[PDB]
Structure 1
Amino acid sequence: DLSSLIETADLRLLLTTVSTEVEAQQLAQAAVEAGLAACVSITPIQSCYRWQGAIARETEQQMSFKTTVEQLDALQQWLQSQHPYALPECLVLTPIASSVAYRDWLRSSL
C-alpha cells in the first residue's frame, strides 16, 4: 500500500563517490543490471579533503545505491572490484521506515 508507513530494518543505502559522470553512469547501470541494487542515484558534488598533505577540492559524483542487507556484502565486494579508486568512499545508512509499496518494490527488484 502506497500510503502506509512501516518500520524497516533490512533496507540499506550505500554511499560512494567517483570522479567522472561516465564512471558513475557505468557503475550505476552495471549494479542494477547485476541485481545488486534496486535503484542508484547520482548527483554532482564538490569534495574537500586532505591529500598528500594539502587540501584538495575536487568535483565528483556522489552515488547512492538502494539495496537490502542480503545484497550489501556482494555489492561492496563487487564495487571494490569495479571502483576506479584504490580506496573508495563507502558508508552505509539504514532507513528505519518506508512505505509498504516501496519496500515491496525494492525487495522484488532484488
Structure 2
Amino acid sequence: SLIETADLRLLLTTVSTEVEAQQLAQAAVEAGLAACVSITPIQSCYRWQGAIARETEQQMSFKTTVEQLDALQQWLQSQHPYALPECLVLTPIASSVAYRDWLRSSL
C-alpha cells in the first residue's frame, strides 16, 4: 500500500562520462550515501561563459534519505571539485511501505 513520505529524497546531478557515472554510483552505494542510483544518457544545452554549450552528459538520480542528503551532496562534489554540476533535489510525496523500508534499511 502507498504511504505518505516526507523523508525520502531524489538528488539529480550530471557528470560528463558514463565511466564516471558508473564509478560514482557504485561508490555512493558502497559508502551508504544512497540506496540506489540510476544513470540515463542525456543531451544538455546551457548558458556557459557567455555562450550556448551543447553536450552529451549522464543524468544521475540518487535515491536517499534527508538524513544522508547533505553528506551525499558534499561527497559527490569532492569527486569532481573543478565542476559546477547540476544539483536539484526532489521530494517524493508517496512510496510503498516496502520500498521506503528498503531504502531506509540500506542506509
> TM-score if structure 1 supplies the norm length?
0.94
- Secondary structure at the counterpart of residue 10 of structure 2: strand
Asked if the contact 1:18/1:84 (under 8 Å) is kept, the reply is: no
**Residues in 2 aligned to 1:93 and 1:52: alpha-carbon distance in whole angstroms:** 28
Superposed CA offset, 1:41-91 (max 9, x none): 000000000122111110000000000000001101111111364212110
Which 4+ residue blocks in structure 1 deviate beyond 4 angstroms? Answer: none
**Residues in 2 aligned to 1:25 and 1:42: alpha-carbon distance in whole angstroms:** 8
**Residues in 2 aligned to 1:39 and 1:23: alpha-carbon distance in whole angstroms:** 16
**RMSD in angstroms over aligned alpha carbons?**
1.0
Instruction: Name the structure 1 match of 2:26.
Output: 29
Q: Which runs of 5+ in 1 are unaligned?
A: none
> TM-score if structure 2 supplies the norm length?
0.96
Q: CA deviation at 1:14?
A: 0.2
- Secondary structure at the counterpart of residue 105 of structure 2: helix
**Residues in 1 aligned to 2:93 and 2:86: alpha-carbon distance in whole angstroms:** 23
**Would you say how many aligned residue pairs link Structure 1 and Structure 2?**
107
Instruction: Name the structure 2 match of 1:105.
Output: 102
**TM-aligned CA distance change 1:80 to 1:42, over 3 Å:** same
**Residues in 2 aligned to 1:61 and 1:84: alpha-carbon distance in whole angstroms:** 17
**TM-aligned CA distance change 1:107 to 1:6, over 3 Å:** same
**Sequence identity (%):** 100
